Design a protein around this ligand. Structure first.
Ligand SMILES: N[C@@H](CCC(=O)N[C@@H](CSSC[C@H](NC(=O)CC[C@H](N)C(=O)O)C(=O)NCC(=O)O)C(=O)NCC(=O)O)C(=O)O
Ligand SMILES: N[C@@H](CCC(=O)N[C@@H](CSSC[C@H](NC(=O)CC[C@H](N)C(=O)O)C(=O)NCC(=O)O)C(=O)NCC(=O)O)C(=O)O
Ligand SMILES: [Cl-]
Ligand SMILES: [Cl-]
Lengths: 222, 221
């Protein structure tokens, strides 16, 4: 509000979800200011943040270029910015097309399949009040299953939809980079070669590397 | 093998396929239910994985659109509503701000209600080990989901656009299924606005009819 960027992006630094939106904003050359919402201090349950998102979870977006339009759910945030602002369709499918709905299917797989299950692996590994190996194993195996699904497609085609990198592919990047540290003796390239190549190719793009380097800086020992 | 516009592949006990059936009914679109029995691991069959590489129900084939195949229940709903609800009886207009609010709520359903409700069911009934702290974690999360809905629905009739849409409809099947997994739970007493909203939708014949079909199928092994 007291910055001149088109978007306010509210995120928690350790989360996969806000940075995903940042990747897309960078790709689309849209200006944004990050506003940190510190989940470690329970700031996501503050009245201020819950006015933005009644779910009380990060991230959320305010589009100051559209009369301060507020939207949450990281995948819906991505869809909103791509549909409205990716005029040249550099990284998104045209609305209405069959491909748009396949692009949507893949984002729902990311949001409902990758995200919550990766999140439960992290939860039972680090944050649950007791250590439960059967629960950790359940979600470790699920993470590997998710990689296998991606591999089954990406070993046969370059990108998830439309013959080029889109918001569907981009949406997996942050969680995929985060999760490898929670898997046993994990060699990404060895175990899922096509998925690894796809992941690392995206991560080399300066539009994606810059915010990801910023996350690393924010989380690093100051 | 049938003359209906859609083949809807679902598992009878799942919340997700019936949600799609509700929307098909609302839009007077013809469909044939094709059961994929998860109890027999049919969701990992070669035939089904050709439809959905994730190997989870449901999936859709639109025989009115060159046998278009799509999976993820919320994406299936969006496709059907965007393409066929031209009068916008139960959906927001594509492109509009309200479309993205409608999308936000469907993602809350798909990423927030569904997976957490599903883990409650999992740790209650299906996990090899019985783990009280896991059951507690997801019971509390289910109640939290209701509290989010209540925060909104106590102040406005519908989630978006001043009308019942696919956003509201998407919560119905799971909200009926979950209450049997909660202790000492009186929906109306605990979350009065959410309860009234839910019960109103469940009463619609477009929703009750497929839900009664679910009951029928559930009753027979
Ligand atoms: N579908 C939503 C998901 C949004 C989401 O997951 N937001 C997280 C980002 S913080 S990152 C994920 C977060 N981790 C934690 O809460 C651990 C914090 C640790 N104790 C500390 O002190 O830092 C978490 O929610 N773990 C449990 C789980 O995933 O089920 C959040 O706000 N969580 C806070 C809350 O729920 O109150 C979207 O895509 O936008
Ligand atoms: N985001 C997807 C979710 C799709 C989904 O959850 N599909 C389920 C429907 S069956 S219902 C949910 C299912 N239940 C079970 O696996 C127990 C089944 C019992 N024995 C019976 O016979 O009904 C399950 O996946 N429980 C664990 C969890 O939710 O994490 C499925 O195919 N599961 C099979 C699989 O994953 O192999 C969508 O919305 O489309
Ligand atoms: Cl975030
Ligand atoms: Cl199903």
């Amino acid at each position: 509000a007291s910055h001149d960027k088109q978007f306010s992006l509210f995120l928690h630094k350790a989360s996969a979800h806000g940075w995903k939106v940042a990747f897309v904003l960078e790709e689309l050359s849209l200006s944004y200011e990050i506003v940190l919402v510190d989940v470690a201090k329970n700031e996501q349950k503050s009245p201020e943040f819950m006015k933005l998102n009644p779910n009380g979870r990060t991230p959320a977006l305010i589009d100051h270029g559209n009369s301060d339009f507020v939207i949450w759910e990281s995948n819906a945030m991505v869809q909103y910015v791509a549909d409205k602002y990716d005029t040249e369709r550099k990284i998104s499918m045209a609305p209405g097309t069959d491909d748009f709905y396949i692009q949507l299917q893949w984002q729902y797989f990311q949001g409902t399949g990758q995200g919550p299950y990766f999140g439960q692996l992290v939860w039972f590994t680090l944050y649950h009040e007791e250590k439960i190996p059967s629960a950790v194993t359940r979600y470790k195996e699920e993470a590997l299953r998710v990689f296998s699904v991606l591999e089954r497609v990406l070993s046969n085609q370059e990108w998830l939809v439309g013959g080029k990198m889109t918001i569907a592919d981009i949406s997996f990047v942050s969680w995929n980079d985060m999760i490898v540290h929670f898997l046993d003796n994990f060699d990404f390239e060895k175990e899922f070669p096509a998925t690894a190549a796809w992941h690392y190719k995206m991560l080399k793009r300066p539009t994606i590397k810059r915010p990801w380097d910023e996350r690393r800086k924010l989380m690093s020992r100051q």
